[PDB]
Amino acid sequence: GGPSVFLFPPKPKDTLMISRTPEVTCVVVDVSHEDPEVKFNWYVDGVEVHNAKTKPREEQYNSTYRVVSVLTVCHQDWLNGKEYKCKVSNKALPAPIEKTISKAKGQPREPQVYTLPPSREEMTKNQVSLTCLVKGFYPSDIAVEWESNGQPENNYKTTPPVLDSDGSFFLYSKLTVDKSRWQQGNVFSCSVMHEALHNHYTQKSLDKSTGKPTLYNVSLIMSD
Amino acid sequence: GQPENNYKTTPPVLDSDGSFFLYSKLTVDKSRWQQGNVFSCSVMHEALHNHYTQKSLDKSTGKPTLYNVSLIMS
Amino acid sequence: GGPSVFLFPPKPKDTLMISRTPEVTCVVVDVSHEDPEVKFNWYVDGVEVHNAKTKPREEQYNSTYRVVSVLTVCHQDWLNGKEYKCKVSNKALPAPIEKTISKAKGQPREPQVYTLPPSREEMTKNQVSLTCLVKGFYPSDIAVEWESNGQPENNYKTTPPVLDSDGSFFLYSKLTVDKSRWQQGNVFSCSVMHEALHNHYTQKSLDKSTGKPTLYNVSLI
Amino acid sequence: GGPSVFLFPPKPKDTLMISRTPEVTCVVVDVSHEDPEVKFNWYVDGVEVHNAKTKPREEQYNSTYRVVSVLTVCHQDWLNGKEYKCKVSNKALPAPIEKTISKAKGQPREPQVYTLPPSREEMTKNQVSLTCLVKGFYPSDIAVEWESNGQPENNYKTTPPVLDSDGSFFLYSKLTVDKSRWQQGNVFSCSVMHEALHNHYTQKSLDKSTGKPTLYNVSLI
């Protein structure tokens, strides 16, 4: 019956990328088809904004409508942590419902990033996997991306953040590639972007060498 | 000696093929780690033999090759 | 001949920084005392904008009135390359002077950033020098910063770049450290910020054990 | 048409080199059409010496004539720092224009020159960059050359001097070499000549992975 508004907080990668800073999404489902009018209101820091954007409603089979609306606001305004408010009003709802969305409040912590070279047992498999773990970041806003200078990697795996005992978060990023590419000393890195990180960018490149005491296995030459 | 409790397992996630994969992390002290203590992760799955498979670590990863670089004098 | 109006280009650091939005400043110098207030007009692609601001007049050592006006432009707008116009009207000035600036146009090519480890005698002296160079950028809008284990310390050398034989500009950056800092092996980050780089910001890490090729290294000529 | 005078400091390499004859040039531009000839007077050590090198006048679309007066001085006279006086008189100018040139000899500091091993990543690029650091000099007149195997290098880049916290300027010398030349073990020498330098020459030899001790050292990886 009554439409229900779902809260979709901005993805921190959206805030970081230049092209998609202003986008803020309000989504409403279970909208009654009897009432065609939809009222949308944005409250930023307690005041109403003049400009608004709303896409046409989407028809659903089960007598429901989907309403997606986009609000434009500076990314630095969202980074300030001020509360944002979304209001959706319709004739079906006896009273308007106000929803508040804001970034999680907490003490920022500098995350730690570590890369792991593949185990010896994995060269039996055709595809070799590389892992980059990040840990010790209290906010849930994190962006980990695999990067190579020669060419960006199509494959990209990331597990959802897992709560830690101390209250921070940790996760892993996985990249599967071919054996030949890894053996040829290809440059790989896991760019990590966090609100607490300085410059909002940290690069930890992984080298081919595993640090074994003997890897050359070639007799050296002395020249005076 | 005995099983531990300071271990966290990530929820399973999808892959390109479709088969799931996940990680598990255990936090320990460096004093016991540097002493050469075995640490084993046991996985129970239906497809595994006897529904049990243990993988152990003896901090012996990256063992140097038997061959060594020859030293000469000029 | 009366007040002079200029439009200073935005600083390179603010232009390429997502957090610090670029700022466009317009300056009026030698303003007549009898006419301190000057009418300001700011146009973005021929459109009036209400976000322009001007700072209060500040006295100069030469007893000449100087006026500055700042406008906050969109970070994406500078990437696009929009046109901004500043117009200053003064009663003393017979004809207003308008200054026009535009974003540099050129082929975006990814610069290469290299790090030079100190030699085997650089630690003999009291100060050890760490150098990071950037080559192969056509636009002059680039930023280079130094980072030491999360402690911001930059010498702001900002040595002027010089064109190469192929026309690809290059620049160098130098930092001075102590013997203990170099011998510790802590990571030192040369951070480069340019249009052509991925995500507009990249870093290069240099350590004491920055790298040793598998091939033998000769100790004598 | 508003005649102008410009000051051109002399090249230090002319004075430092015994074979090269030092020359001091004073140049006048924006000479009006009605008076192409400019009355030029030259004084050294407050006295008149009979030598002059006046360039012939040339026609330009802006009706501006450039006149250069060149004076010959000895190495000892140049090292003294005595003022050289150029006086220019024109019909259009109500009064003669005076200019003087004299470099300041203050706090002569012997420059320190260092060479760094090539960066690891440079082996991937088909061009290898060689860097020569020089610092510890107060004056801005420094001579730099790249003398490889006894013959000067065709291409070399010199960064302009910049300010420093120690009060002495520093700069870099960049050389580009092919990977094949560096693979065979070619040796390049960076020669630095300064007015306060001992015997006006400092140089050293470098190779792949330069090491001051006679030992094979390898860092962590």
XYZ file of C-alpha atoms in Angstrom:
740
model
C 0.000 0.000 0.000
C 1.919 2.972 1.344
C 5.150 3.724 -0.511
C 8.363 2.897 1.348
C 11.549 4.936 0.908
C 14.825 3.002 0.988
C 18.073 4.632 2.102
C 20.977 4.375 -0.356
C 23.997 6.236 1.050
C 26.477 7.597 -1.507
C 29.224 5.176 -2.455
C 32.551 6.749 -1.368
C 34.041 5.970 -4.788
C 31.237 8.115 -6.225
C 32.328 10.966 -3.950
C 35.971 10.479 -4.952
C 35.428 10.410 -8.725
C 35.038 13.892 -10.201
C 32.231 13.114 -12.649
C 29.834 11.644 -10.061
C 30.366 13.876 -7.012
C 26.947 15.636 -7.020
C 24.712 12.570 -7.368
C 22.618 11.608 -4.335
C 19.927 8.969 -4.839
C 16.521 8.670 -3.180
C 14.647 5.466 -4.051
C 11.005 4.669 -3.254
C 9.244 1.341 -3.836
C 5.744 -0.057 -3.245
C 4.185 3.123 -4.644
C 0.434 2.858 -5.157
C -0.616 3.278 -8.784
C -3.837 5.077 -7.804
C -1.977 8.282 -6.902
C 0.080 9.598 -9.854
C 1.524 12.612 -8.040
C 4.802 12.237 -6.134
C 6.286 14.954 -3.914
C 10.055 14.937 -3.351
C 11.900 17.251 -0.962
C 15.590 17.591 -0.096
C 16.678 19.117 3.226
C 20.396 19.952 3.248
C 21.661 21.232 6.619
C 18.034 22.089 7.408
C 17.252 24.177 4.306
C 15.528 23.455 1.001
C 17.449 23.473 -2.286
C 16.023 25.220 -5.337
C 16.979 22.716 -8.053
C 15.837 19.099 -8.233
C 15.961 16.141 -10.614
C 13.621 13.149 -10.829
C 13.414 10.400 -13.438
C 10.054 9.045 -14.649
C 8.504 6.287 -12.563
C 9.003 2.630 -13.489
C 6.016 0.301 -13.790
C 6.038 -2.980 -11.863
C 3.782 -5.991 -12.355
C 2.689 -6.357 -8.724
C 0.668 -3.107 -8.641
C 3.749 -1.153 -7.562
C 5.836 1.753 -8.832
C 9.536 2.557 -8.481
C 10.610 6.191 -8.074
C 14.287 7.149 -8.362
C 15.330 10.762 -7.814
C 18.721 12.467 -8.020
C 19.824 15.460 -5.941
C 22.904 17.553 -6.742
C 25.183 18.748 -3.936
C 28.902 19.378 -3.528
C 30.995 16.415 -2.408
C 32.767 18.531 0.222
C 29.363 19.284 1.762
C 28.752 15.552 2.206
C 32.313 15.119 3.496
C 31.530 17.591 6.299
C 29.268 14.958 7.870
C 26.180 17.172 8.017
C 22.849 15.363 8.032
C 20.852 15.080 4.809
C 17.085 14.588 4.744
C 14.843 13.026 2.090
C 11.072 13.591 2.138
C 8.560 11.697 -0.004
C 4.897 12.724 0.124
C 1.914 11.067 -1.549
C -1.846 10.876 -1.105
C -1.607 7.216 -0.056
C 0.499 8.070 2.999
C -1.629 9.813 5.668
C 1.422 11.813 6.796
C 4.775 12.566 5.147
C 7.769 10.446 6.144
C 11.161 12.091 6.687
C 14.345 10.022 6.398
C 17.782 11.107 7.619
C 21.022 9.915 6.006
C 24.543 10.834 7.090
C 28.059 9.434 7.213
C 29.002 7.203 10.132
C 30.448 9.126 13.085
C 33.603 7.817 14.722
C 37.282 8.381 15.305
C 39.139 8.185 11.964
C 41.939 5.624 11.770
C 44.709 5.239 9.208
C 44.239 1.906 7.389
C 47.069 -0.566 6.869
C 47.544 -2.170 3.443
C 49.595 -5.309 2.782
C 50.085 -7.344 -0.395
C 50.628 -11.102 -0.383
C 52.530 -13.033 -3.066
C 51.002 -16.277 -4.357
C 51.766 -19.549 -2.604
C 53.979 -22.223 -4.145
C 51.066 -24.649 -4.609
C 49.211 -22.327 -7.013
C 51.482 -22.475 -10.085
C 49.965 -25.920 -10.646
C 46.744 -24.088 -11.512
C 46.656 -22.241 -14.828
C 45.422 -18.999 -13.226
C 47.446 -17.363 -10.440
C 45.769 -15.198 -7.800
C 47.145 -12.095 -6.076
C 45.758 -10.774 -2.789
C 45.876 -7.296 -1.248
C 44.436 -6.916 2.250
C 43.396 -3.702 3.994
C 42.660 -3.490 7.704
C 42.168 -1.144 10.626
C 39.814 1.446 9.109
C 36.822 2.287 11.302
C 34.623 3.972 8.638
C 32.944 1.692 6.119
C 33.937 4.065 3.289
C 36.794 2.349 1.431
C 37.787 1.934 -2.220
C 40.276 -0.758 -3.287
C 41.154 -1.066 -6.975
C 43.666 -3.242 -8.812
C 45.883 -1.236 -11.162
C 48.619 -1.988 -13.691
C 50.598 0.517 -15.744
C 50.483 -1.580 -18.915
C 46.729 -2.194 -18.934
C 43.868 -2.135 -16.403
C 42.710 -5.562 -15.256
C 39.213 -6.727 -16.175
C 39.049 -9.112 -13.205
C 38.424 -7.614 -9.763
C 37.150 -9.363 -6.623
C 36.370 -7.709 -3.287
C 34.762 -9.166 -0.171
C 32.364 -7.070 1.918
C 33.923 -5.398 4.967
C 34.035 -7.539 8.110
C 33.827 -6.042 11.592
C 36.916 -6.489 13.768
C 37.159 -7.083 17.510
C 38.582 -3.597 18.118
C 35.711 -2.096 16.095
C 37.652 -1.404 12.888
C 37.117 -3.101 9.516
C 39.189 -5.268 7.194
C 38.799 -6.834 3.761
C 40.687 -8.406 0.865
C 41.025 -7.746 -2.864
C 41.684 -10.579 -5.317
C 43.101 -10.466 -8.849
C 43.429 -13.585 -11.005
C 45.832 -13.434 -13.964
C 47.855 -15.769 -16.165
C 51.069 -17.472 -15.083
C 53.099 -15.928 -17.916
C 52.085 -12.365 -17.022
C 53.069 -12.840 -13.373
C 56.349 -14.551 -14.292
C 57.285 -11.683 -16.640
C 57.477 -9.248 -13.708
C 54.314 -7.310 -14.527
C 53.668 -4.246 -12.372
C 50.632 -4.651 -10.104
C 49.321 -2.420 -7.326
C 46.214 -2.105 -5.154
C 45.193 1.542 -4.887
C 43.432 2.184 -1.570
C 41.254 5.251 -0.994
C 39.879 6.195 2.426
C 38.575 9.364 4.048
C 41.203 9.275 6.810
C 44.064 8.559 4.391
C 46.207 11.522 3.388
C 45.651 12.675 -0.225
C 42.914 9.966 -0.342
C 45.250 7.635 -2.246
C 47.731 4.947 -1.197
C 49.637 2.683 -3.595
C 51.352 -0.570 -2.559
C 52.968 -2.149 -5.613
C 53.863 -5.844 -5.504
C 57.166 -7.038 -6.963
C 57.879 -10.349 -8.677
C 60.775 -11.197 -6.349
C 59.735 -13.113 -3.230
C 62.837 -12.123 -1.256
C 64.329 -15.614 -1.191
C 68.056 -15.730 -0.327
C 68.890 -17.423 -3.655
C 66.802 -16.546 -6.712
C 69.401 -15.692 -9.357
C 70.859 -19.234 -9.536
C 73.439 -17.891 -12.020
C 77.186 -17.752 -11.404
C 78.411 -14.180 -10.992
C 81.313 -12.537 -12.834
C 84.125 -10.530 -11.215
C 85.677 -7.628 -13.126
C 88.278 -5.330 -11.575
C 48.119 -27.637 21.392
C 44.502 -26.470 21.326
C 42.121 -24.626 18.982
C 42.007 -20.839 19.135
C 39.114 -18.371 19.033
C 40.522 -15.103 17.596
C 39.621 -16.001 14.013
C 37.319 -14.169 11.598
C 35.821 -15.692 8.445
C 34.526 -13.540 5.604
C 31.141 -14.411 4.086
C 31.276 -16.350 0.809
C 31.154 -14.318 -2.400
C 30.548 -15.121 -6.052
C 33.222 -15.466 -8.740
C 33.403 -15.272 -12.528
C 32.892 -19.027 -12.914
C 30.303 -19.165 -10.130
C 32.157 -21.164 -7.497
C 32.432 -19.381 -4.161
C 35.641 -18.307 -2.438
C 36.441 -16.816 0.957
C 39.261 -15.949 3.354
C 39.843 -16.430 7.078
C 42.146 -14.350 9.276
C 43.754 -15.238 12.611
C 45.562 -12.736 14.843
C 48.444 -14.029 16.975
C 51.476 -12.696 18.833
C 54.896 -12.469 17.208
C 56.561 -14.293 20.116
C 54.833 -17.585 19.295
C 55.022 -17.016 15.528
C 58.810 -16.571 15.520
C 59.277 -19.755 17.588
C 58.187 -22.033 14.733
C 54.635 -23.019 15.681
C 52.387 -24.949 13.299
C 49.059 -23.324 12.429
C 46.420 -25.354 10.593
C 43.166 -24.297 8.950
C 40.565 -27.054 8.606
C 37.869 -26.824 5.926
C 34.679 -28.903 6.046
C 32.789 -29.130 2.746
C 30.468 -31.698 1.193
C 32.643 -32.262 -1.885
C 35.787 -32.779 0.209
C 36.897 -36.297 1.091
C 35.541 -37.369 4.502
C 34.090 -33.830 4.803
C 37.400 -32.595 6.226
C 40.654 -31.180 4.858
C 43.468 -29.616 6.890
C 46.167 -27.280 5.570
C 49.072 -26.560 7.914
C 51.731 -23.842 7.954
C 55.189 -24.232 9.518
C 56.433 -20.728 8.548
C 58.681 -22.484 6.008
C 57.323 -20.600 2.984
C 59.866 -19.263 0.509
C 62.500 -21.915 1.172
C 65.676 -21.053 -0.782
C 66.633 -23.297 -3.678
C 69.318 -25.938 -3.213
C 71.502 -24.322 -5.878
C 73.492 -21.260 -4.837
C 75.288 -18.489 -6.697
C 78.931 -19.374 -7.293
C 81.592 -17.012 -5.940
C 84.733 -16.328 -7.982
C 87.826 -14.175 -7.482
C 89.352 -11.820 -10.047
C 47.562 55.166 -16.197
C 44.991 54.614 -13.479
C 44.067 51.222 -12.045
C 45.249 48.073 -13.806
C 43.121 44.912 -13.910
C 44.595 41.421 -14.230
C 43.281 37.861 -13.914
C 45.772 35.619 -12.157
C 45.628 31.953 -13.203
C 44.580 29.510 -10.470
C 47.310 27.736 -8.551
C 48.205 24.293 -9.972
C 47.657 22.576 -6.611
C 44.054 23.773 -6.279
C 43.138 23.031 -9.907
C 43.909 19.300 -9.719
C 42.778 18.745 -6.107
C 39.330 17.227 -5.609
C 39.063 18.375 -1.982
C 40.494 21.868 -2.582
C 38.367 23.367 -5.342
C 40.247 25.686 -7.732
C 39.867 29.418 -7.138
C 40.024 32.152 -9.787
C 41.372 35.512 -8.619
C 41.108 38.928 -10.272
C 43.312 41.783 -9.056
C 43.001 45.561 -9.417
C 46.121 47.601 -8.656
C 46.845 51.335 -8.383
C 43.206 52.037 -7.528
C 42.491 55.744 -7.145
C 41.958 56.896 -3.564
C 38.903 58.981 -4.487
C 37.252 55.857 -5.986
C 38.066 52.889 -3.729
C 34.955 50.846 -4.555
C 34.988 49.268 -8.024
C 32.101 47.450 -9.690
C 32.827 43.745 -10.206
C 31.344 41.446 -12.851
C 32.094 37.728 -13.172
C 30.910 35.755 -16.203
C 31.049 31.974 -16.629
C 30.621 31.222 -20.349
C 28.558 34.392 -20.654
C 26.360 33.533 -17.649
C 26.150 35.644 -14.501
C 26.992 33.794 -11.278
C 26.122 34.815 -7.716
C 28.958 32.902 -6.004
C 31.625 35.531 -6.742
C 33.171 37.295 -3.756
C 35.665 40.098 -3.158
C 38.014 40.643 -0.238
C 38.160 43.964 1.644
C 40.709 46.480 0.410
C 44.156 46.076 1.976
C 46.661 48.919 2.193
C 49.961 48.418 0.368
C 53.429 49.588 1.394
C 53.518 51.948 -1.610
C 50.254 53.589 -0.419
C 48.403 52.127 -3.417
C 44.974 50.537 -3.075
C 44.870 46.863 -4.082
C 41.626 44.927 -4.582
C 41.266 41.154 -4.954
C 38.178 39.190 -6.004
C 37.913 35.405 -5.664
C 35.459 33.041 -7.356
C 35.068 29.334 -6.597
C 34.847 27.402 -9.864
C 33.705 23.801 -10.150
C 36.493 21.226 -10.132
C 34.908 19.396 -13.075
C 34.462 22.713 -14.901
C 38.221 23.316 -14.949
C 38.729 19.803 -16.328
C 36.213 20.618 -19.067
C 37.938 23.935 -19.781
C 35.261 26.578 -19.290
C 35.842 30.292 -19.885
C 35.778 32.827 -17.040
C 35.664 36.604 -17.509
C 36.399 39.308 -14.926
C 35.263 42.894 -15.532
C 36.144 45.829 -13.269
C 34.449 49.224 -13.590
C 35.935 52.341 -11.987
C 34.907 55.986 -12.236
C 38.532 57.127 -12.532
C 39.281 54.563 -15.243
C 37.946 55.826 -18.601
C 37.549 52.362 -20.155
C 37.265 49.054 -18.260
C 39.948 46.430 -18.864
C 38.942 42.784 -19.312
C 41.433 39.919 -18.992
C 40.700 36.588 -20.687
C 42.337 33.270 -19.774
C 41.790 29.727 -21.002
C 42.860 26.224 -20.047
C 45.932 24.831 -21.780
C 45.192 22.623 -24.792
C 47.413 19.663 -25.618
C 47.633 15.924 -26.063
C 47.329 14.147 -22.674
C 50.252 11.741 -22.290
C 50.997 9.866 -19.079
C 54.154 11.175 -17.358
C 56.785 8.778 -16.046
C 57.898 9.211 -12.426
C 61.264 7.777 -11.363
C 63.120 7.705 -8.041
C 66.910 7.933 -7.738
C 68.441 6.198 -4.700
C 71.432 7.926 -3.088
C 74.903 6.782 -4.078
C 77.320 4.830 -1.883
C 78.917 8.071 -0.634
C 75.846 10.307 -0.212
C 75.466 9.119 3.390
C 79.067 10.130 4.145
C 77.928 13.757 4.333
C 75.602 15.014 7.057
C 72.607 15.398 4.716
C 71.406 12.636 2.377
C 69.583 13.689 -0.794
C 66.546 11.850 -2.174
C 65.469 12.740 -5.716
C 62.284 11.976 -7.646
C 61.844 13.094 -11.256
C 58.784 13.380 -13.502
C 59.050 13.431 -17.299
C 56.787 13.524 -20.314
C 54.005 16.005 -19.529
C 52.836 18.612 -22.035
C 50.681 20.768 -19.700
C 52.453 22.737 -16.985
C 49.693 21.965 -14.438
C 51.379 19.370 -12.220
C 52.033 19.023 -8.490
C 54.824 17.158 -6.687
C 54.845 16.556 -2.928
C 56.933 14.638 -0.397
C 55.597 12.324 2.313
C 57.483 10.584 5.139
C 55.497 7.916 7.026
C 52.396 10.095 7.285
C 54.275 13.193 8.475
C 53.888 16.018 5.910
C 57.228 17.706 5.222
C 57.807 19.368 1.841
C 60.741 21.576 0.857
C 58.609 23.281 -1.858
C 61.649 23.515 -4.121
C 59.326 23.739 -7.182
C 62.204 23.917 -9.636
C 60.992 25.347 -12.978
C 60.650 22.690 -15.685
C 62.640 22.890 -18.916
C 61.654 21.511 -22.314
C 63.455 18.432 -23.621
C 64.571 17.602 -27.168
C 61.220 15.964 -27.986
C 59.235 18.745 -26.291
C 58.199 16.627 -23.295
C 58.660 18.724 -20.162
C 60.319 17.313 -17.052
C 61.053 18.367 -13.483
C 62.942 17.125 -10.428
C 62.232 17.177 -6.692
C 64.793 16.957 -3.886
C 64.490 16.156 -0.181
C 67.125 16.223 2.563
C 67.220 13.591 5.319
C 69.544 12.538 8.127
C 71.803 9.486 8.238
C 69.530 7.677 10.704
C 66.434 8.281 8.568
C 68.117 6.843 5.469
C 69.607 3.893 7.371
C 66.249 3.089 8.998
C 64.712 2.173 5.642
C 61.391 3.948 6.163
C 59.198 4.496 3.118
C 59.424 7.889 1.403
C 56.608 8.819 -0.980
C 56.979 11.143 -3.959
C 53.363 12.021 -4.768
C 52.575 13.317 -8.258
C 49.304 14.958 -9.297
C 48.546 15.539 -12.977
C 45.728 15.356 -15.511
C 47.086 12.307 -17.345
C 47.586 10.117 -14.264
C 44.954 7.575 -13.278
C 42.559 9.002 -10.658
C 44.581 12.273 -10.961
C 46.875 11.274 -8.055
C 49.670 8.700 -7.899
C 52.573 7.942 -5.570
C 56.036 6.405 -5.839
C 57.660 4.656 -2.875
C 61.408 4.749 -2.198
C 63.169 2.755 0.527
C 66.745 2.066 1.555
C 66.371 -1.305 -0.191
C 64.571 0.267 -3.138
C 65.634 -2.558 -5.461
C 68.546 -4.728 -6.603
C 68.626 -6.245 -10.115
C 69.183 -9.984 -10.382
C 72.126 -9.295 -12.694
C 75.469 -8.786 -10.986
C 76.427 -5.222 -10.053
C 80.053 -4.351 -10.809
C 81.921 -2.545 -8.029
C 84.707 -1.330 -10.350
C 84.982 0.158 -13.830
C 59.725 55.695 -29.654
C 60.729 55.072 -26.059
C 64.239 53.634 -26.348
C 65.110 50.867 -23.901
C 68.359 49.461 -22.513
C 68.900 45.877 -21.362
C 71.650 44.358 -19.220
C 73.267 41.085 -20.312
C 75.614 39.430 -17.794
C 78.720 37.829 -19.318
C 79.111 34.079 -19.610
C 81.359 32.691 -16.835
C 82.820 30.029 -19.142
C 84.465 32.733 -21.267
C 86.375 34.145 -18.289
C 87.129 30.742 -16.745
C 88.554 29.336 -19.988
C 92.014 30.749 -20.684
C 91.643 30.269 -24.447
C 88.207 31.906 -24.534
C 88.278 35.704 -24.447
C 85.821 37.270 -21.961
C 83.274 39.635 -23.492
C 80.793 42.041 -21.894
C 77.870 43.114 -24.084
C 75.460 45.996 -23.495
C 72.405 46.006 -25.767
C 69.978 48.803 -26.678
C 66.569 48.151 -28.247
C 63.530 50.173 -29.366
C 65.665 52.651 -31.313
C 63.431 55.100 -33.161
C 63.485 55.296 -36.950
C 64.420 58.982 -37.231
C 67.701 58.394 -35.330
C 68.998 54.925 -36.268
C 72.491 55.815 -35.033
C 73.017 55.631 -31.266
C 75.899 57.458 -29.586
C 77.687 54.747 -27.595
C 80.329 55.319 -24.919
C 82.260 52.644 -23.035
C 84.262 52.845 -19.800
C 86.229 50.152 -17.950
C 87.752 50.769 -14.499
C 86.694 54.388 -14.970
C 89.076 54.768 -17.927
C 88.844 54.705 -21.721
C 90.300 51.764 -23.671
C 90.339 51.728 -27.479
C 88.200 48.765 -28.506
C 84.652 48.527 -29.839
C 82.426 45.960 -31.587
C 79.242 47.598 -32.900
C 76.793 45.349 -34.729
C 75.309 46.751 -37.962
C 71.764 48.069 -37.861
C 68.928 45.904 -39.175
C 65.463 46.684 -40.515
C 62.443 45.395 -38.600
C 58.682 45.614 -39.051
C 58.426 47.378 -35.666
C 60.938 50.093 -36.695
C 63.174 49.025 -33.796
C 66.966 48.793 -34.053
C 69.105 46.596 -31.796
C 72.625 47.879 -31.082
C 75.089 45.685 -29.170
C 78.389 47.020 -27.814
C 80.978 44.376 -26.893
C 83.983 45.030 -24.647
C 87.002 42.793 -24.063
C 88.298 42.371 -20.504
C 90.991 40.191 -18.975
C 90.406 37.303 -16.582
C 91.968 39.211 -13.677
C 89.895 42.310 -14.463
C 86.706 40.229 -14.592
C 87.582 38.565 -11.279
C 87.979 42.024 -9.716
C 84.285 42.803 -10.175
C 84.923 46.370 -11.325
C 81.946 48.092 -12.922
C 81.747 48.344 -16.713
C 79.924 51.458 -17.916
C 77.823 51.793 -21.087
C 76.418 55.238 -21.930
C 73.875 55.625 -24.737
C 72.713 58.935 -26.217
C 69.878 59.426 -28.708
C 68.282 62.483 -30.285
C 64.799 61.448 -29.136
C 65.915 60.934 -25.531
C 66.128 64.285 -23.680
C 68.934 62.942 -21.467
C 71.582 60.245 -21.963
C 70.921 56.796 -20.516
C 73.495 55.165 -18.233
C 73.939 51.468 -17.488
C 76.551 49.547 -15.523
C 77.402 45.865 -15.148
C 79.309 44.365 -12.213
C 78.868 40.922 -10.669
C 78.982 40.735 -6.875
C 81.860 38.747 -5.348
C 80.507 37.770 -1.945
C 81.226 34.690 0.192
C 83.050 32.457 -2.333
C 81.921 28.905 -1.536
C 83.460 25.879 -3.236
C 80.688 23.879 -4.956
C 80.120 20.229 -4.084
C 79.351 17.825 -6.937
C 77.716 14.406 -6.623
C 76.675 11.640 -9.008
C 73.871 9.156 -8.432
C 73.444 5.639 -9.844
C 70.740 5.262 -12.508
C 67.268 4.329 -11.322
C 66.154 0.712 -11.616
C 63.013 1.462 -13.644
C 65.211 3.319 -16.155
C 66.347 -0.044 -17.546
C 62.814 -0.651 -18.844
C 62.824 2.580 -20.854
C 64.978 2.554 -23.978
C 66.459 5.890 -22.834
C 68.468 6.029 -19.596
C 68.693 9.297 -17.656
C 71.885 10.308 -15.838
C 71.756 12.937 -13.084
C 74.599 15.145 -11.826
C 73.887 17.179 -8.689
C 75.821 20.339 -7.848
C 75.303 22.605 -4.841
C 77.190 24.713 -2.322
C 77.762 27.715 -4.607
C 76.683 31.262 -3.752
C 76.972 32.961 -7.185
C 74.688 32.052 -10.072
C 77.539 31.839 -12.630
C 78.422 28.139 -12.942
C 79.985 26.255 -15.854
C 78.873 22.659 -16.445
C 79.940 20.182 -19.133
C 79.465 16.483 -19.886
C 82.882 15.139 -20.923
C 82.478 11.444 -21.746
C 85.631 9.643 -22.938
C 87.384 12.989 -23.404
C 84.763 14.420 -25.777
C 81.790 16.654 -24.932
C 78.303 15.173 -25.048
C 75.911 16.380 -27.737
C 72.863 16.716 -25.458
C 72.711 17.898 -21.846
C 70.094 19.753 -19.795
C 70.907 22.241 -17.026
C 68.231 23.289 -14.553
C 68.179 26.986 -13.600
C 69.474 27.768 -10.101
C 66.885 28.061 -7.337
C 66.839 29.373 -3.785
C 67.763 27.141 -0.852
C 67.544 27.265 2.930
C 71.342 27.046 3.251
C 71.822 30.219 1.188
C 73.708 28.431 -1.612
C 72.000 27.596 -4.894
C 71.874 24.079 -6.328
C 71.135 22.653 -9.760
C 71.089 19.454 -11.805
C 72.593 18.150 -15.037
C 70.536 15.630 -17.015
C 71.882 13.399 -19.785
C 69.965 10.983 -22.018
C 71.757 7.862 -23.259
C 70.776 4.779 -25.230
C 70.306 1.493 -23.393
C 72.908 -0.232 -25.585
C 75.587 2.286 -24.584
C 74.873 1.795 -20.876
C 74.729 -2.001 -21.220
C 78.291 -2.193 -22.565
C 79.550 -0.230 -19.551
C 80.110 3.271 -20.901
C 81.531 5.856 -18.493
C 80.350 9.479 -18.481
C 81.994 12.310 -16.535
C 80.294 15.457 -15.217
C 82.746 18.371 -15.261
C 82.007 21.450 -13.141
C 83.940 24.719 -13.448
C 83.486 27.575 -10.975
C 85.168 30.912 -10.321
C 85.750 29.986 -6.660
C 86.745 26.410 -7.546
C 90.299 25.145 -7.120
C 91.997 24.954 -10.547
C 88.541 25.610 -12.087
C 87.769 21.915 -12.622
C 86.005 19.110 -10.740
C 85.042 15.765 -12.259
C 84.563 12.098 -11.413
C 83.824 8.815 -13.167
C 80.684 6.715 -12.765
C 79.430 3.343 -13.978
C 76.551 0.923 -13.389
C 75.729 0.680 -9.661
C 78.498 2.962 -8.423
C 80.008 1.860 -5.124
C 82.600 3.778 -3.120
C 83.844 0.716 -1.162
C 85.528 -2.081 -3.102
C 82.858 -4.609 -2.183
C 79.792 -6.249 -3.718
C 76.808 -4.997 -1.705
C 73.150 -5.909 -2.273
C 70.223 -4.547 -0.273
C 66.963 -6.298 0.571
C 64.354 -7.106 -2.064
